[PDB]
Design a binder for this molecule. Structure first.
Ligand code: HEM
Ligand code: HEM
Ligand SMILES: CN(C)CCCOc1cc(=O)sc2ccccc12
Ligand SMILES: CN(C)CCCOc1cc(=O)sc2ccccc12
Ligand SMILES: C[C@H](O)[C@H](O)C1=Nc2c(nc(N)[nH]c2=O)NC1
Ligand SMILES: C[C@H](O)[C@H](O)C1=Nc2c(nc(N)[nH]c2=O)NC1
Lengths: 414, 414
């Protein structure tokens, strides 16, 4: 009865009663059950599956500028059969591509989507070993990175069966610095990854107690316990934070992984659901800039970039934070362009995302947009995606959230 | 079937089909019917009214740190009677206060609410003439302004009857510069008020064709045609825009009314609904700063504050707009503090709004917050009201939107 709500930054939580007295949405919540897809303990009710699959295959053969009628029907029967006999079914890799592409084309909270059109699909379906996974990942990371010239790709591990033979990597994202909470009340690297770093420690991985130490991809292949693997340094291409003016910057000791790749997130297509399918794209300055660097609950410089900025660090009204940040954002962006790593300032992004929509509507007359997310964390009213009214909605295929593996995991370790 | 959506800034509109294919919110829309209260042609179905009123009166006698049981019951019967006999009813002014206070306390999109506790109620109920209204307004404006030291207040005009004896002022807000769209494809003052300025012209008011000319409060008292009245200059206290450094600023020729007072907006309490009740509060820098000044669809300096800022006005990625704005915001704020007019930089606001909630939950365990609105148009992720999860909802009493009078108005002019 009491809709729980939490203030991220502070980690505070309160239960809302009063909403009951409503005259008769929870749009500002982060992980609504309305956007996930948890575990299972048995396959997928044919009645449910079968009609979905028909839908998909139908969507698929829809694309073509020229129709493959026969193949369409044919494929249709082909599947039903396949399904009726076994229940489950496999998509022709070609399908899986169009899947991932659309599932992205149908991401509600991603300004990126303007080039959903071209992504790299890594058919790791045949995968079968934890260590087999790992390798498959590095192939990705390495392909993705491309020595700074980032290329976005996704590697589809094997789908779901009984839901007890799940394939899952327990990581927020491919590369992400640890976050040891040091003795002296301090806290290193990244507090965000605070609970998880503990995990990797609890499963081996030795605490280099740094503050810019990359975390171990912890994977599980069929439903058995997960295993720790250290990402091969050679693969993690970073960028150092230096200002095109404030020389005192480098002294900050700031750098950041040049590759944003989400690990934990379920892909769902034709009634089929894949519990592991890391995908990457390149950064937008502000996440690095204002989010991990500035956000109070993350790295959190600002105050310092403020003091050494000379600014009125103690007269809030001064707009010093407004000053500081803007410089920090120019640094990050700067560094990147310099050390030759791909990136994109928000403005240019928003300008393009809009172009996407005009295309998307004139195209299929829709575009699942989540304003609360598609708006640059700073400079909102200046980026066009603010004066844009948008309604969002889950479609298909679609990338979903998932429950923290460690929460719902039958530890086969007996 | 086609949810229409418009991009403000550009004035573009598109109909969303695709949402139908939804797996099964419109939170980013501006004026949902879910937040209004249009016309009527007959009173209010006793069955509807009577139970509401009971609710209210009950809420009322609830407040007290010490209960007025007898008076409570008494008042209750008193009303029912009053209602059963006539249907309608009047709230003891004292009630109307607690009304307005709560109706505010229950504003979903206002960071202000942290001091809902003290507002000024102007009982203009007895009003009866257009000209009678006018005077009543100036009393407000004048009280509100207070020679810069702004004080927030509201003046409750007479309630609703048959819904054909509506009391309404056709104004976005008390003071607001005109917006003539000059011959030479130009556009002066404020394009926002473009359709309305035409109106006042169509009803008399002479076009001083300026670009900082205050508009005429156009009012209607009982349901008859509306009449034009020029706000007495002496009452409109403005502020000139000057930078605490960029001397070349004053050359911009920028100033802005120091008093934000919303005209058109219905107050609803105990089943009773008042179609006219202007209320004011003091500015938050960013609306003036980034919204009316910078917003592409408004005044729109930025580019110039950019060029004369020296900045890379042509290399979007430069973050020049990010630079420009921040200065503009310091100016506005600056001027104000200088010319001694009340104002408040967003940061300090957000810091307080949060304090409100912690209070509001610990108080009545709720707080109708609309994240999409309660977030400063610039510097979002830096203000705490971003990492705050919030669900919003219409309660009571409550200030509602209303249909543009000129749309639904039986022009008694025969
Ligand atoms: C054109 C390159 C891309 C850019 C610049 C980009 C940018 C972004 C940004 C800025 C966010 C929100 C950041 C956050 O708050 O975590 C986001 C979210 C997201 N993007 Fe992208 N993206 C790109 C490509 C892609 C691709 C190719 C996919 C799918 C294979 C994708 C899927 C997603 C998803 C699912 C989210 C939501 C993540 C979450 O809920 O945590 N993006 N993207
Ligand atoms: C502490 C002084 C106040 C401050 C600083 C303040 C500030 C604000 C701000 C920044 C907004 C959003 C601006 C926009 O986008 O138009 C807003 C909206 C609003 N405020 Fe306040 N406010 C104050 C007092 C009040 C009071 C006393 C009332 C009720 C008598 C009130 C009622 C509203 C309403 C109804 C809205 C929504 C307006 C709309 O939907 O256009 N505010 N306020
Ligand atoms: C997922 N999030 C909770 C954490 C990583 C930040 O995510 C991203 C930040 C960017 O700037 S670009 C991008 C592209 C594709 C996937 C993710 C991102
Ligand atoms: C209503 N809006 C469409 C137009 C006026 C802007 O509204 C306000 C801007 C501020 O900074 S403060 C404030 C206080 C009380 C009412 C309104 C405001
Ligand atoms: C609590 C609040 O909903 C949350 O902090 C939000 N996070 C994000 C957001 N938008 C983006 N793009 N990324 C976020 O992390 N909007 C709101
Ligand atoms: C289109 C978009 O919903 C609209 O421009 C928004 N306006 C506003 C907003 N928030 C505030 N405070 N004021 C606005 O005018 N959020 C979103």
């Amino acid at each position: 009865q009491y809709v729980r709500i939490k203030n991220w930054g502070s980690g505070e939580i309160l239960h809302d009663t009063l909403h009951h007295k409503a005259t008769s949405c929870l749009g500002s919540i982060m992980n609504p059950k309305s956007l996930t897809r948890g575990p299972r303990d048995k396959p997928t009710p044919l009645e449910e599956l079968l009609p979905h699959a028909i839908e998909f295959i139908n969507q698929y053969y829809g694309s073509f500028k020229e129709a493959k009628i026969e193949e369409h029907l044919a494929r249709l029967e082909a599947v039903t059969k396949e399904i009726e006999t076994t229940g489950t079914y496999q998509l022709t890799l070609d399908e899986l591509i169009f899947a991932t592409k659309m599932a992205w084309r149908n991401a509600p909270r991603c300004i990126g989507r303007i080039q959903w059109s071209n992504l790299q699909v890594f058919d790791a379906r045949n995968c079968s070993t934890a260590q087999e996974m790992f390798q498959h990942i590095c192939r990705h990371i390495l392909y993705a990175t491309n020595n700074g010239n980032i290329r976005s790709a996704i590697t589809v591990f094997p789908q779901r069966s009984d839901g007890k033979h799940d394939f899952r990597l327990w990581n927020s994202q491919l590369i992400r610095y640890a976050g040891y909470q040091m003795p002296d009340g301090t806290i290193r690297g990244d507090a965000a990854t605070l609970e998880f770093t503990q995990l990797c420690i609890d499963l081996g991985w030795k605490p280099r107690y740094g503050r810019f130490d990359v975390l171990p991809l912890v994977l599980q292949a069929d439903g058995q316990d997960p295993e720790v693997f250290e990402i091969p340094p050679d693969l993690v291409l970073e960028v150092t934070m230096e200002h095109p003016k404030y020389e005192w910057f480098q002294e900050l000791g700031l750098k950041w992984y040049a590759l944003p790749a989400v690990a934990n997130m379920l892909l769902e297509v034709g009634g089929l659901e894949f519990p592991a399918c890391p995908f990457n794209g390149w950064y937008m300055g502000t996440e690095i800039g204002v989010r991990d660097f500035c956000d109070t609950q993350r790295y959190n410089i600002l105050e310092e970039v403020g003091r050494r900025m000379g600014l009125e660090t103690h007269t809030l009204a001064s707009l010093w934070k407004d000053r500081a940040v803007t410089e920090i954002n120019v640094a990050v962006l700067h560094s990147f362009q310099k050390q030759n790593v791909t990136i994109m300032d928000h403005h240019t992004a928003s300008e393009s995302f809009m172009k996407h929509m005009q295309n998307e509507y004139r195209a299929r007359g829709g575009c699942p947009a989540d304003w609360i997310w598609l708006v640059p964390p700073v400079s909102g009213s200046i980026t066009p995606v603010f004066h844009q009214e948008m309604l969002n909605y889950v479609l298909s295929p679609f990338y979903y959230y998932q429950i923290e593996p460690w929460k719902t995991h039958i530890w086969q370790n007996e």
